[PDB]
């Protein structure tokens, strides 16, 4: 199970000029390219070692896509302003994501595409990849063009054919790094949290991919979890915690499940 | 490779 998702953001700036537009591309949990107008290179560029040997034709094309997407979104920001009857003075956000998924078998599992105005769903491509879901009275007017157009068709064509073809190519290009599983380095901390109480924090460090299951169990179970965070070197880190009776730590064992571990690992607090 | 065609709303 692998993915090729991109995340496009456009933000209007009534003070300054043209909206700020940013694209980022991810193979699974690894970013590999990005585009940013209001930047030295008004161009798509690599963001992973293994993309640095793609030819000029690749970058010249993928730049044209990003720049064109930005120009259309420039219009969309002003369109949706009209729809919702908002003033020029206010700054608004428009986000577009799209992703395909491969199965174990290596074939297309699923594809999805949504855009959101001001951090709330606007228009959504449904599971069947042929019909849109409009959140709002306004989104229906947009949808009316998207339906009548058969954007559905064009986006299905990307998600089913192009997206998976290129996901495959990237998985091979960056196979050394991407298709490698790094398991978590696991340890257990302890902090008084008073006299009668005590904390037990179970750490998992340096694991790719970011999907992981930390669970705190006692013999015969209310755990605090924190958003898995980026290490800043491809790998990730996460911790789960539990408040236990002071001096009864040894009843409590941490269970770490990762794709890159032979068998799920079990921890206890080091005396 | 990103989606080569995008929605006009």
């Amino acid at each position, epitope marked *: 199970s692998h993915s090729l998702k991109y995340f496009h953001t456009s933000v209007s700036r009534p003070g300054r000029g043209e909206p700020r537009f940013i694209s980022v591309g991810y193979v699974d949990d690894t970013q590999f390219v990005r585009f940013d107008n209001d930047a030295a290179s008004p161009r798509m560029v690599p963001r992973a070692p293994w993309m640095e040997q793609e030819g000029s034709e690749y970058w010249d094309r993928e730049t*044209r896509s990003a720049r*064109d*997407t930005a*120009q*259309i979104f*420039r*219009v969309n920001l002003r*369109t949706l302003r009209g729809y919702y009857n908002q003033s020029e003075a206010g700054s608004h956000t428009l986000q577009w994501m799209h992703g395909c998924e491969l199965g174990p078998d290596g074939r297309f599992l699923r594809g999805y595409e949504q855009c959101a105005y001001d951090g709330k769903d606007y228009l959504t491509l449904n599971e069947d990849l042929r019909s849109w879901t409009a959140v709002d009275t306004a989104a229906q007017i947009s949808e009316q*063009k998207s339906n*009548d*157009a*058969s954007e559905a068709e*064009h986006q299905r*064509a*990307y998600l089913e*054919d*192009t997206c998976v*073809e290129w996901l495959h190519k990237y998985l091979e290009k960056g196979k050394e790094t991407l298709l490698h599983l790094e398991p978590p380095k696991t340890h257990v901390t302890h902090h008084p949290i008073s006299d009668h109480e005590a904390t037990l924090r179970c750490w998992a460090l340096g694991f790719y991919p970011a999907e992981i299951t930390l669970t705190w169990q006692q013999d015969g179970q209310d755990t605090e979890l924190v958003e898995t965070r980026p290490a800043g070197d491809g790998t990730f880190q996460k911790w789960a915690a539990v408040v236990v009776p002071s001096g009864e730590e040894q009843r409590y064992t941490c269970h770490v499940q990762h794709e890159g571990l032979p068998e799920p690992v079990t921890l206890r607090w080091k005396p | 490779v990103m989606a*080569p*065609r*995008t929605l*006009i709303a």
Partner: T-cell receptor
Amino acid sequence: KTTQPPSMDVAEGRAANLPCNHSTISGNEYVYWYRQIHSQGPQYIIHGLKNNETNEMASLIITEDRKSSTLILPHATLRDTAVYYCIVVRSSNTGKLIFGQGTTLQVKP
Amino acid sequence: GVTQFPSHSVIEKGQTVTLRCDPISGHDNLYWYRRVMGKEIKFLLHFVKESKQDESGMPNNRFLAERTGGTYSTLKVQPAELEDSGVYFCASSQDRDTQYFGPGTRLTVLE
């Protein structure tokens, strides 16, 4: 990028099979057919990607290998005498037409 | 149907001509193509509403195209030159797949 005969003849009543070559096509490149009856506005006929397509006017037959295509005007008329442009359009946000020389079709009375 | 104006045009080299086009009402996408003497029909410009999306086919500084209203579009040649002589075809599209072309403005710049 897209190569056709310079000119083709068809006795009216009988179907006109307009061939087109595009070996260098990708999976994100659709095959479009337009025409021009004397020098008035170009007119969209039909288009497709991989599977066969029929519409009110014509049918488009793309090969399995997708290198070759055939446009079928089912029963040719004196109206159908025109220049027939076969154009590849890569899925983009403009989808501009690049016009080849095109097949000039004479519908023989 | 797309409407263009004028149907025909004959001007002296150096003079200023402006072509008009009214797209099928509702169509967000407006295109300019042309066939100069010799060559085939070639793409000039693509508008997505009032905003220019693709200028890649616009020859030089002498050619200026505007669709501020986001409806009908103008195209001003200033100054007009001999080599400009050709047919100028406007088109509109709802889906950007089917382009509906107008009857075309026929332009002859004459020494």
